[PDB]
Amino acid sequence: MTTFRFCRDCNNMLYPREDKENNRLLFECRTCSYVEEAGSPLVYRHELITNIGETAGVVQDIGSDPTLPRSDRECPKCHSRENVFFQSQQRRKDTSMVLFFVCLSCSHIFTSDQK
């Protein structure tokens, strides 16, 4: 799940296989017959829910947008009195209403989760 394995030779991807002979896990391109050591204890992973720490893309020049409201919360890092905040950008009916404050200076993200 960390990264889909791609063959160094050619450009295809490496499905996974078992080296029981050496009782090991080896990823195989099975097109050009390229096999490496393939050292990883994870094969597949599925995530049922979505976390809250994803915030947003937080692209630079976020302060250039005038539609984002401004607040006066103190930044934990630089102790500034100016910042912008927005709700979580995950679009579902179960997401909470926690605000993600973004510091225009020092490029810091701090949430309002006082739980």
Partner: protein, 172 residues
């Protein structure tokens, strides 16, 4: 929900200076809930059956699957996109070059009117003329079409990955 389609993305391309065409390219996801298929197939015009996007990408010159995956998603940290695209790359193994992609596309076109020697030309003409007839209608410009298809697939996946909202029909 009763329909076997979960999410669908389409663009109604048209020409503002040339003759009116109004050709609809429809991209739909067949993975209704946890059906374990999770396959996406586009709806090419004049072909009554839906072809997987990997064959279309190969027909545009993007033969390797890694290049297609890079085109679809521009970030490597979004592992969810790769997880949902894994069935597509697994189903794209039927075609391994441009020639077999064109053969597959042509075999799903005319009702066996003539041999396969004309199916390649049929697929080439269909993709050059009525495959997104708003970016370009000339030859040798398949990279732009592939990039736009990747952008459309990325938008569809983002909508299906509870990251955006369904587009509103009433927006003026």
């Amino acid at each position: 929900a009763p329909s076997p389609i979960s999410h669908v993305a389409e663009i109604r391309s048209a020409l503002e200076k040339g003759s009116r065409f109004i050709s609809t390219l429809q991209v739909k996801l067949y993975g209704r809930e946890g059906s374990s298929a999770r396959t996406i197939k586009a709806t090419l015009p004049y072909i009554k059956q839906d072809i997987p996007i990997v064959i279309i990408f190969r027909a545009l010159g993007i033969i390797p699957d890694g290049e297609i995956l890079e085109h679809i998603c521009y970030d490597v940290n979004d592992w969810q996109m790769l997880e949902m695209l894994k069935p597509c790359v697994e189903d794209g193994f039927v075609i391994q070059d441009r020639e077999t992609a064109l053969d597959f596309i042509g075999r799903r076109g005319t009702a066996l009117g003539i041999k396969k020697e004309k199916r390649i030309q049929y697929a080439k003409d269909i993709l050059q003329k009525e495959f997104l007839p708003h970016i370009t209608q000339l030859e040798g410009f398949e990279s732009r079409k592939a990039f736009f298809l990747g952008y459309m697939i990325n938008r569809l996946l983002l909508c299906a990955l509870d990251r955006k909202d369904q587009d509103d029909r009433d927006h003026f």
